[PDB]
Amino acid sequence: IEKGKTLVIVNQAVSATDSQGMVTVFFELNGQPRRIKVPDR
Amino acid sequence: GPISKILVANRSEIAIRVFRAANELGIKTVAIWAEEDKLALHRFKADESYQVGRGPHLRDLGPIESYLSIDEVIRVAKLSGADAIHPGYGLLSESPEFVDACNKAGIIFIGPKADTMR
Amino acid sequence: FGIRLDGGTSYSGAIITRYYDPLLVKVTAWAPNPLEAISRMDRALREFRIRGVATNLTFLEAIIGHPKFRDNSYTTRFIDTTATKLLTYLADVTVNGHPEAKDRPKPLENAARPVVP
Amino acid sequence: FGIRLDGGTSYSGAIITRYYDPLLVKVTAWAPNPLEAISRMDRALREFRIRGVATNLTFLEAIIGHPKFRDNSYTTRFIDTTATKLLTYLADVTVNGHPEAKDRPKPLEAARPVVP
Amino acid sequence: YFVRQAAKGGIDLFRVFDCLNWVENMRVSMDAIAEENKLCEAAICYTGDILNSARPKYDLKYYTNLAVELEKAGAHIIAVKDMAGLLKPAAAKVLFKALREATGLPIHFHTHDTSGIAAATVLAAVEAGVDAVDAAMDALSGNTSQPCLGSIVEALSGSERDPGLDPAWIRRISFYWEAVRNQYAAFESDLKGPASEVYLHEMPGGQFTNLKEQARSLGLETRWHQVAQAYADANQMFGDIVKVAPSSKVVGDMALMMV
Amino acid sequence: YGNGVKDGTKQLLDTLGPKKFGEWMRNEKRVLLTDTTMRDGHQSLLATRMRTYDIARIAGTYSHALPNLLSLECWGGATFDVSMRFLTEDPWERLALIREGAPNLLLQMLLRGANGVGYTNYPDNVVKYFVRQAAKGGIDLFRVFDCLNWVENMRVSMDAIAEENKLCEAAICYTGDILNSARPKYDLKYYTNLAVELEKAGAHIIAVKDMAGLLKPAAAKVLFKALREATGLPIHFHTHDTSGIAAATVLAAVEAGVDAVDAAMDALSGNTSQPCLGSIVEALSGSERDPGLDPAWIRRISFYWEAVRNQYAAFESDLKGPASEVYLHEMPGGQFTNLKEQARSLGLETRWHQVAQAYADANQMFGDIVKVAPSSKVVGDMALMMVSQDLTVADVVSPDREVSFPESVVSMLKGDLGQPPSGWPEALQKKALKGEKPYTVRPGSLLKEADLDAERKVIEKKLEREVSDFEFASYLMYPKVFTDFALASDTYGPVSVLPTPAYFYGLADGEELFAD
Ligand SMILES: [Cl-]
Ligand SMILES: [Mg+2]
Ligand SMILES: [Zn+2]
Ligand SMILES: [Zn+2]
Predict the structure, then answer these.
(1) Where are the beta strands (DSSP E) in D7-58?
(2) Bridge partners of F235?
(3) F337 C-alpha to center of ligand 4: Å?
(4) CB proximity D113 to C under 8 Å
(5) Is C4 an 8 Å CB contact of chain D?
(6) Are F204 and F18 spatial neighbours (Cβ–Cβ below 8 Å)?
(7) Residues whose CB falls within 8 Å of the CB of residue F465, separated by 6 or more in sequence, listed in order
(8) Is D83 annotated as a binding residue?
(9) Between D4, D6, D12, which is nearest C12 by CB?
(10) Which positions are annotated as binding CoA 2 (chain D) (predicted)?
(11) Distance between Cα F51 and ligand 3 center (Å)
(12) Please, are residues F91 and F83 in contact by the beta-carbon 8 Å criterion?
């Protein structure tokens, strides 16, 4: 992301698409938990 | 000057025990891993974790023999810049060979002194 | 040491339903001090790893890392009156594909990443 | 209440290879008294769900209920000297059918009987 | 404004061309380049065949004249932009001799290997004294791209005009590119090699593939044999014009339409 | 899309005979052209999988549209056993069909002296018998080569071809760089001497077989001048476009005086195939040595191939265009396809770059040898394993390292491919061959002459019917492969008659098919 400064990213899982039609991707990001919300087109 | 960074010259829970006692105090952690220990959580539950055993500096070293190799320990205590080696138990915890390389590098063995080991 | 967990519903395979109180796992910290309780509760909460559903661990650490709370200057109106972009892409494209690659040939399964000489 | 856990080496889908100590968790039960300690420990020990790989929980639940541990009459030689089927059938018939019915009249496509 | 920023940004050599070879349409840019104190390579687009008496609009005088005009307009370098890879080795023998007699400027030759004989033309061109040439790394060369850098270099190795490039390093880089290119499996054309028919239609390397995956989009997939001729015809109907982005395009739309 | 067929080099050969035909080639101003589309083209790009059905149908167009062609290379090489083994079809029937389609052109086969179509080594009388049937079958121009360039191992074949009153084109295999003082073993005298010896051996024509496309243009200029000063016979040049500069070399050669050149129709040219025929003709067009081939027709035919080639999607390789690595490894074009897809099938798809370096090294370790089918194979195998076993060359020749050398290596080192002029490297072979004893004479000359009447009897009893001289010829070359085709034929009728899509894929639902 910079000349530093590496992001270690893992794809942990993905969920069934909900209502509002939003998917949730579960990442590991430098050994921490994050979840991101995306629609499924 | 304080001990700001801890290596756990061990694996398993007992590593995981120490990361915690340490963590709650604001103390940063450090792990170590074999090749066949590439999946062990403690390496991920560390603040940072470098390999031991494998690689162009070794042929490789057998899973446990690597968690024992004091060539490797120092090489990794240094590479992170960590200043106290908590040997935990079992594996290496009561050797002077492990308190002579820790004294070859100048690091602090969280236990009794070197010749208390013999 | 010092942590208790009232478990019950949370595991791998678990099915979480919007009919009921949203209680995944109740946590209780113990310390011989009320300022190590806070780090013994901070620590466990930061150690959790739940995949599939979101949680309020970020908000749960947030209150116990907060200056008003950590020393007892707090009331019952306390709460009422109180990279990512890059993971968004990744997430979006992992779920939906990129439009320029979506319906065309994919690379061999099975292919060595380029190494700079 | 009163169960300390020191584990974290084990979880759903994890791999346990054979090169090290195969310690899964460390169950630690405390009690107000020494005996409410064992039933607390025996309750945890039981409550547990582990599958994919074999366990000593049924060796541990045989150690803590034996009257020699209960009252402190053990020495260092206490030890050394003392549904699928259903899913199968279903699938089997789901796939090949029952020979007594597979070649005859089927019921309408149907009120499950209801007991009054 | 754009040439300014481009020069600020890091461009040193600007190859500037015009899609109907119209010098009038090149001055604003050439002036700009020169004002930024950078290199102005004014390209002449090649088309037709100087040795074909039967198509005389594009004869040799046509190029040498444009070379002289372009010098007058302040070129530092003249480029022959052979965008459809139509120049042929015998013509290269002639063209580069002529131009180097017509101007004292350096000559830069850029071509495409659609015919699958571009390397031949490059080597003839070099024999005739051309000052610089373009080639692509191996991993990305041949077909509608440039001729093979590695192979051109090897062929000149130890001759009086040896470019002295390390062919070990060329291989090393080329292997890397080969890896990169595997990633782009998505954007590969279905063109399998040489096509001499480039000499019938003259569709540029950029746009010979695009057009074929226009020609199928439109259901004449069994027909890029008449489209071939239509492009050739439409070109002539327009007065036989220079076909490079975006002129090329125009001709294509017509050829498609006529079929 | 005419009228009857203009007489061609076929009529010319029948009237002059092979010897005076060659002097005609020598005397002709225009360069002569062999199209390789029907043999080498699809050998090099499509794994020789092109079918009679697609190939027979274009004979008559060739016949009417391009009557100035010197020859159609359309038989021999891998096509003999591939047709039978993989396409379920008689190569004699293929040859017959092209013969009746193009009664005016020469028909050309690649023949490997020692072995003909040769999966192995055959008594002289079997090589003799084979050439006789090939001449009966329709062949006029035999390009004969020897994988070590050992003239001695070509005398039998040459004599047979001559005996049958057909063209003997003896080929010199090109390797190395004649202009590279560094690698002195394959210099100019090497080739010129060879030319002269091939002339004494009775060749009507000398070919230069640049199997890996290694000739560079500057050398084509030197070499072809030299050869034509060295022998009065006509010179024919064959090459592959793996460097993506063979077209230059061809053009260089033409200027240099060369008498004939190979190329492939555009749709099956380039890469490991020959340089593009359409484009070489266009470059020559209007020059003193203009071949006079109608480029409109070249295009038409090319387009037909292009269509034909789309049918064989499954045999397309992952190769993406010009590769100057060819100068480093030297893998022939007809063996750059099979090998890197054999290396996939082995679990070595990511490490084919390393392979190349050892295949280069190997060559040097065997003593820098000509590498064309089958020497080429034998060489592949060494790098294959120097990587599979992660071994280097002092490691391959290591008293304390048990290498299980491939059969092919065992075999070549023993004598079955013949002798390179330097012989074989003692130590490697001493270790390679494991107590088994080597020889140094012509493998042909040690073999008991085949009891033809007996051997015929074996096969006839086996099919339970009489066989034709042709079919019998096939059996001598490939007993097992022929046996099987014979029986697969008895079951399936003449599947050669099926359109390619039906042959590889049968029929869709409701789909209708005319089949003759
Ligand atoms: Cl066989
Ligand atoms: Mg001649
Ligand atoms: Zn271009
Ligand atoms: Zn060949």
Answers:
(1) 26-29
(2) F206
(3) 12
(4) no
(5) yes
(6) yes
(7) none
(8) yes
(9) D12
(10) 49
(11) 38
(12) yes
> In b/e form, how buried is each residue of C43-78, taking b as 16+ CB within 10 angstroms?
bbbebeeebbeeeebeebbeeeeeeebeeeeeeeee
Chains B and D touch (3+ CB pairs under 8 A): yes
Query: How many C-beta atoms lie closer than 10 Å to residue F317's C-beta?
Result: 16
Q: Which of F116, F148, F50, F372 is nearest to F238 (CA)?
A: F372
* CB distance F324 to E170 below 8 Å: yes
Q: How many CB pairs under 8 A join B and C?
A: 12
- Residue F285: which of E124, E59, E53 has the closest Cα? E53
Hey, which residues 155-174 in chain E have their CB within 8 Å of chain F?
Answer: 155, 158-159, 167, 170-171, 174
Count of alpha carbons within 13 Å of F267, Cβ hemisphere only?
16
Partner-chain contact A41 C96, CB within 8 Å: yes
Please, which residues have CB within 8 angstroms of residue E220's CB and are 6 or more apart in sequence?
A: E226, E227, E256, E259
* Residues of chain B that touch chain D, judged by Cβ-Cβ distance less than 8 Å: 11-13, 16-17, 36-37, 39-42, 45, 63-64, 90
Chain breaks of chain D after residues with C–N above 2.5 Å:
82, 109
- Quick one: tokens of C1? 């040491």
Q: What is the DSSP letter of F116?
A: B
Question: Can you tell me the distance from the alpha carbon of C101 to that of C96, in angstroms, rounded to the nearest whole number?
Answer: 11
Matching CATH number, F319-448, of 3.90.76.10, 1.10.472.90, 1.10.760.10, 3.40.1190.20: 1.10.472.90
- Find out whether C51 is annotated in a ligand binding site: yes
Residue of F nearest to E85 (CA): F279
Residue C103 phi, psi dihedral angles, 5° rounding: -115, 30
**CA atoms lying within 13 Å on the CB side of residue C22:** 5
Facing residue for A12 by CB, picked from C51, C84, C86 = C51
What is the rounded distance in angstroms from the CA atom of residue F334 to the CA atom of residue F340? 12
Cross-chain residue pair E194–F299, CB shorter than 8 Å: no
With beta carbons less than 8 A apart as the criterion, state whether F177 and F214 touch: yes
Q: Residues F379, F359: contact at Cβ < 8 Å?
A: yes
CA distance D28 to chain C (A): 10
Residue D8 CA to residue B41 CA, distance in Å, equals 7
**Alpha-carbon gap, residue F273 to F280, rounded angstroms:** 14
Residues of C near A (Cβ–Cβ under 8 Å) read 48-52, 54, 83-84, 86-88, 90-92, 94-96
Q: Are B73 and B32 in contact (CB under 8 A)?
A: yes
Contact present, F55 and F96 (Cβ < 8 Å) = no
Of F6, F12, F21, F16, the residue nearest F67 (C-alpha): F6
Q: Which of C101, C108, C117 sits opposite E182 (nearest CB)?
A: C108
Q: How many Å lie between the alpha carbon of A10 and the closest alpha carbon of chain C?
A: 10
- The answer to whether D49 is a known ligand-binding residue is yes
- CATH numeric code, E1-187: 3.20.20.70
Count of alpha carbons within 13 Å of F229, Cβ hemisphere only? 9
Resolution (A): 3.1
Number of helices (H) and strands (E) in chain E: give both, helices first: 11, 5
Give the minimum alpha-carbon distance from C40 to chain B in angstroms, rounded to a whole number: 6
State the best of E151, E175, E212 to mutate against chain F, taking most chain F CBs within 10 Å: E151
How far CA D26 is from CA of D2, D57, D59, E25, F119, in Å, comes to: 14, 12, 15, 82, 68
Asked if F269 and F26 touch (Cβ cutoff 8 Å), the reply is: no
From CA A6, how far away is CA F68, in angstroms rounded? 67
Residue A10 pairs in a beta bridge with A28
Chain centroid to CA B97: how far? 14
Chain F nearest-CA residue for E192:
F267
Q: What is the CATH number of domain F449-494?
A: 1.10.10.60
Q: What CATH number does the domain located at F11-318 have?
A: 3.20.20.70
Do A and F make contact via 3 or more CB pairs under 8 A? The reply is no
